[PDB]
Design a protein around this ligand. Structure first.
Ligand code: NA
Ligand code: NA
Ligand code: NA
Length: 161
């Protein structure tokens, strides 16, 4: 953990609550977003918890954490990214559930969702074996989001004309 950076205990507490209910379920899930970076030693503050999973996993997670569901899992799509998307709030912390995230391809097709198991690693942390997507994958994913943002920004700037 570069910089001996520590994840704020509120996030670890909620992560434990999530881990405890998923650990012995057949759910294909990973922590993604900032918490995945942090768990893998990148000193970044976490503000919410992102769980990426497959389509079935999103609905299973929602059911497992039914009392915490703030937004029902629904297939949700922009023109760029879609997923089976819902939200939990646990102890005031937002948990984004994203099942089978797919990115739009140049041709308008949707990429197949990632094989989470190609990139999943288990981080031993605070007595928990937490599945995360690899830093390499995460970095590449954010850089890709970045490209999308840049293209959209340029389009919007031009649209203002
Ligand atoms: Na920590
Ligand atoms: Na799995
Ligand atoms: Na960290």
């Amino acid at each position: 953990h570069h910089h001996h950076h520590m994840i704020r205990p509120e996030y670890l507490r909620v992560l434990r609550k999530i881990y405890d209910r998923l650990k012995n379920e057949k759910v294909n899930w990973v922590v993604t977003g900032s918490l995945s970076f942090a768990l893998q030693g990148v000193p970044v503050e976490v503000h919410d918890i992102d769980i990426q999973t497959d389509e079935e996993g999103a609905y299973e997670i929602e059911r497992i954490f039914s009392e915490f569901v703030s937004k029902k899992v629904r297939f949700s799509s922009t023109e760029k990214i879609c997923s089976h998307f819902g939200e939990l709030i646990i102890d005031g912390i937002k948990v984004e559930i994203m099942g089978d995230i797919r990115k739009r391809l140049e041709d308008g097709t949707w990429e197949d969702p990632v094989d989470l198991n190609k990139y999943k690693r288990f981080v031993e942390t605070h007595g928990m074996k937490i599945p995360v997507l690899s830093l390499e994958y995460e970095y590449q994913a954010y850089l890709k989001l970045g490209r999308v943002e840049k293209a959209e920004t340029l389009r919007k700037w031009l649209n203002e004309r």
